[model samples]
Target: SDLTFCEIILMEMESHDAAWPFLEPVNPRLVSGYRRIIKNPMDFSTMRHRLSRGGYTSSEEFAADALLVFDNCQTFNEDDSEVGKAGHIMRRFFESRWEEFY
Candidate 1:
């Protein structure tokens, strides 16, 4: 509980890397579905950039995208839920296509 946000982020990066190779690749078939889920949503481009490595390979890109997707998962009206509407959207997406990216 004493970890700073930056420290937590760094730890996540480490754990993510360790688990990368065992994952399945993201399916291109679900791109359309994912696009629909975030359509016209605020760019959040800055957030994406901050969450990723500019020179990363395709696998890294997919990993970053998955993390961002899950991070944004929330219901439209969670009130006090950590994962609100965005999380709901993500959960749906994952249920349908996450395994494709695993």
Candidate 2:
């Protein structure tokens, strides 16, 4: 019950097709410069663990962490790239619902 709000929104994003790219932490070994490029990487799996472990203090912190996923995507990829496009779609979806929920 404590995490119901963020958990609900998280499930929605995880189900989105665009979520494929952000489902897990990016493979630094596979993706070049991943460590150097994205200073603070965030993903669905990390969020899931955080939620389960009570890692977040408030909804604001949770939302910001999720937004970091999109922000990192934009910084590392072009708008036309596959992951980049997914980032855009997911970001919009998250924001719209967050407003309504809050």
Candidate 3:
């Protein structure tokens, strides 16, 4: 699977603050691609399952589950431009959702 646009953005954001200003601008293409990852039904289902399976009863537990998902996924190349990798999307997806879900 290729890296999702979110993965690429996150990777670059960590690498060097100035690295991808032009290469990966946050335009509609990137925004739409990322929104699609969460919007995608199959992707949403898997993410929901990952979070629910733990039966988290607290914010700490919810965060732990989200960390596990992020830790288990393959890291993406900083320059990758693709936008539909399940692992990539799921990591970021859970990162943002854990707090809300908790």
Cα lDDT listed for each candidate: 0.38, 0.91, 0.37
User: By descending lDDT, how would the candidates be arranged?
Assistant: 2, 1, 3
Per TM-score, what order, best first? 2, 3, 1
Q: Who is ahead in lDDT, 1 or 3?
A: 1
Q: Between which residue pairs do clashes occur in model 2?
A: none
Per-residue lDDT over 25-99 for candidate 3, one digit per residue giving the tens place of the 0 to 100 score: 234454434344332122222434544464434445434434543333232222243332444554565555433
State the lDDT at 39 in candidate 1: 34
Residue ranges of candidate 1 with Cα displaced over 4 Å: 1-54, 72-83
Clashes per model (N, Cα, C within 3 A): 13, 0, 0
Using alpha carbons, what is the TM-score of model 3?
0.31
Clashing pairs in 3: none
Q: Model 3 off-target regions past 4 Å?
A: 1-55, 75-84, 99-102
TM-score of every candidate = 0.28, 0.95, 0.31
Better of 2 and 3 by TM-score: 2
Steric clash count of candidate 3: 0
Error of 2 at 19 (Å): 0.2
